[PDB]
C-alpha cells in the first residue's frame, strides 16, 4: 500500500509546473524559493525529494496554482 | 420490388473458350449478366448483387452489393481459363450468403454453367437439402456444354424444392444467347 502511495502522488506534476529556483529551507519539509516570476515565496516540499540535492540555489520546479517544491 | 440477394456463378473455365454461341460464350454469359443486373435493378434497388467464379480458387470478385457497375467492371478480362468446378461453386455461393447484412433479402442464385460437369446425384441431393434448410432457390441458365441434357441439375433442383417446391429451376444450353427476358417471360419475378 505504501508503494501504491508513492506512485499516486506523481499526478501533481503533469509537466507544466513552473521553472523556479530553490533558495533556502527554514526547517523540516518547508523552504523558501525565489521564482523566475520575479517574486519570492515561502513553500512546503514533497517528502519524495532526496535532501542531498540542495545547496547553491538549484533549479527547481513549482506548481502553477499551489507553487510548491515538487 | 421483392427483397433478395442475387449470387451469380460465372464460368471462367477453359470450356467456355469456344463458339457454340455466336460470338463467344464470354460475350454470351456477359450479356446475360447485363440482363440480370438490369433485371434486379429495375425490380428493386434495395436488392444486391454478388458474383463468384468456378475456377481453382473460386473468387468473390464483388461482395454482395446492390450496385452493378462494379460487377460490370469485373466482367471484363474475365479470363475463362481453367476447369469447371460445380460442387464448390454452389458451396462458395452457399456459405457466402450467411454473411449478409440485410436478412430480409431472399438468398437467390443464378449460375452460368458452360463446361462439362462431373458431379454426383447424391452430391446434388445433399447440397439440395442443404439448400432446403436455408431455402436458397437457385435458377441456373446453362451457357454451353454442361452435362447430358443438364443432368444432375434438374435432379438437383427437384431435390432442392422437393414435395412441390418449384422455386428453383434449370435452363438449357443447346442453341445460344437466349434472351433471358424471353426465358423469364412468365417467371420474370422468379425464374
Amino acid at each position: 500500500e505504501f508503494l501504491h502511495a508513492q506512485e499516486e502522488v506523481k499526478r501533481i506534476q503533469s509537466i507544466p509546473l513552473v521553472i523556479g529556483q530553490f533558495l533556502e529551507a527554514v526547517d523540516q519539509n518547508t523552504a523558501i524559493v525565489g521564482s523566475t516570476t520575479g517574486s519570492n515565496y515561502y513553500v512546503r516540499i514533497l517528502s519524495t525529494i532526496d535532501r542531498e540535492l540542495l545547496k547553491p540555489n538549484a533549479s527547481v520546479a513549482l506548481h502553477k496554482h499551489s507553487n510548491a517544491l515538487v | 420490388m421483392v427483397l433478395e440477394s442475387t449470387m451469380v456463378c460465372v464460368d471462367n473455365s477453359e470450356y467456355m473458350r469456344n463458339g457454340d454461341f455466336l460470338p463467344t460464350r464470354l460475350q454470351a454469359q456477359q450479356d446475360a449478366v447485363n440482363i440480370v443486373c438490369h433485371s434486379k435493378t429495375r425490380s428493386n434497388p434495395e436488392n444486391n448483387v454478388g458474383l463468384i467464379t468456378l475456377a481453382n480458387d473460386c473468387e468473390v470478385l464483388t461482395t454482395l452489393t446492390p450496385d452493378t457497375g462494379r460487377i460490370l467492371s469485373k466482367l471484363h478480362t474475365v479470363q475463362p481459363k481453367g476447369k469447371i468446378t460445380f460442387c464448390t461453386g454452389i458451396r462458395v455461393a452457399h456459405l457466402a450468403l450467411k454473411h449478409r447484412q440485410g436478412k430480409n433479402h431472399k438468398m437467390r442464385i443464378i449460375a452460368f454453367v458452360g463446361s462439362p460437369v462431373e458431379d454426383n446425384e447424391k452430391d446434388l441431393v445433399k447440397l439440395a437439402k442443404r439448400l432446403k434448410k436455408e431455402k436458397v432457390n437457385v435458377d441456373i441458365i446453362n451457357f454451353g456444354e454442361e452435362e447430358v441434357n443438364t443432368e444432375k441439375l434438374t435432379a438437383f433442383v427437384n431435390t432442392l424444392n422437393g414435395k412441390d417446391g418449384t422455386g428453383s429451376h434449370l435452363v438449357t444450353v443447346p442453341p445460344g444467347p437466349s434472351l433471358a427476358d424471353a426465358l423469364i417471360s412468365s417467371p420474370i419475378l422468379a425464374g
Binding site: 508503494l3 501504491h4 | 468473390v60 461482395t63 452489393t65 464448390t88 458451396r91 462458395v92 452457399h94 456459405l95 457466402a96 450467411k98 454473411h99
Partner: protein, 286 residues
C-alpha cells in the same frame, strides 16, 4: 525479415471482444479480423486491429469468407481517423492454427507485403505467453515439393506506452501483485521456467512415442535435427569444470559474506539507539 514484433495490450482485447461478439454460436466460429501495425524497422510494431465477417464449414476447409468490401470501408474509416495507423497483417482466435490458415495469408499478401498471421488464445491453459504469430515462406525440399510453403515462427512481445500503462495498471489494482517483491520474482521465474521445460518434454515425448510405433509419419523432418539437440548435452561433472564453479561461487559467497557482515552491524545500531531512548525517557519520566 521482421524477426520480432511489439504488440500492444489494446489488441489482444480488441480481439477478445469480437470473439465475444459472435461467441454466442459456441460450437465453432473462428474469429478473424484485420491486424494494424507500423513499418517500424526490421522489427515491426503492432498497435491497432479490427474485425471482419468470416465463416467456414466443417469439411473441406476451403470455404471461408473475408468481406473485402467491409475491409475496404472500415479501413478507409481507420485511415481517415488515423493515417499513422495502417494494415500490417491479420489474426484468428484458433487455439491451434488450422491447415486452412495458409490460404488466408496467401490471399491478403496483396494488401501488406506480408500479411502476418496472429494466433491468439482465449483460453491459454498454458500459463506461459499466449498469442504468438507466424509469417509464411517457401522451403522447397529435396523431396520434390513444387512449392514447400509453410509459416514461420517469429518472436513477439507485448507493447507498452505511458498512457496505456497508466490505465491498465490502474486496472491491475483489482488483484494483488508483487512486482517490486525482492528476490521473489526470480524464484517465480525459475519455477515457471522449469514448468515450461516439463511441459515441452511431455509434449515431445507424446509425439515421439506416437511416431515410434503404430501410426505416424516417420519423415526426416526433425528426427535427426532433434538428435543434434542431444548432441550438445554438456557433460557437467568432469575434470576442469569443477574449477569453473569453485573458482567463482566462493567469489560471490565472499561478497554475500561482507554484505551480511555490514547488515548485522547496521541492525545492531538500532539496539543502542532505542535502548538509550527507552530507559533515558523512563528515568526522566519517573
Amino acid at each position: 525479415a521482421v524477426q520480432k514484433v511489439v504488440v500492444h495490450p489494446l489488441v489482444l482485447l480488441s480481439v477478445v471482444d469480437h470473439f465475444n461478439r459472435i461467441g454466442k454460436v459456441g460450437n465453432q466460429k473462428r474469429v478473424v479480423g484485420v491486424l494494424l501495425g507500423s513499418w517500424q524497422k526490421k522489427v515491426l510494431d503492432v498497435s491497432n486491429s479490427f474485425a471482419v465477417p468470416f465463416d467456414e464449414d466443417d469439411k473441406d476447409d476451403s470455404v471461408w469468407f473475408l468481406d473485402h468490401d467491409y475491409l475496404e470501408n472500415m479501413y478507409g474509416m481507420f485511415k481517415k481517423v488515423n493515417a499513422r495507423e495502417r494494415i500490417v497483417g491479420w489474426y484468428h482466435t484458433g487455439p491451434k492454427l488450422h491447415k486452412n490458415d495458409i490460404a488466408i495469408n496467401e490471399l491478403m499478401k496483396r494488401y501488406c507485403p506480408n500479411s502476418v498471421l496472429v494466433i491468439i488464445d482465449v483460453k491459454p491453459k498454458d500459463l506461459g505467453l499466449p498469442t504468438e504469430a507466424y509469417i509464411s515462406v517457401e522451403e522447397v525440399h529435396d523431396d520434390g515439393t513444387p512449392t514447400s510453403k509453410t509459416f514461420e515462427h517469429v518472436t513477439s512481445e507485448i507493447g507498452a506506452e505511458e498512457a496505456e500503462e497508466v490505465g491498465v495498471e490502474h486496472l491491475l489494482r483489482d488483484i494483488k501483485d508483487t512486482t517490486v517483491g525482492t528476490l521473489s520474482q526470480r524464484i517465480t521465474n525459475q519455477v515457471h521456467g522449469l514448468k515450461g521445460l516439463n511441459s515441452k518434454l511431455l509434449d515431445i515425448r507424446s509425439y515421439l512415442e506416437k511416431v515410434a510405433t503404430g501410426k505416424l509419419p516417420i519423415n526426416h523432418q526433425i528426427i535427426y535435427q532433434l538428435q543434434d539437440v542431444f548432441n550438445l548435452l554438456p557433460d557437467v561433472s568432469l575434470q576442469e569444470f569443477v574449477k569453473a564453479f569453485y573458482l567463482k561461487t566462493n567469489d560471490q559467497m565472499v561478497v554475500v559474506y561482507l554484505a551480511s557482515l555490514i547488515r548485522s552491524v547496521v541492525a545492531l545500531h538500532n539496539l543502542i539507539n532505542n535502548k538509550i531512548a527507552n530507559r533515558d525517557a523512563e528515568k526522566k519520566e519517573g
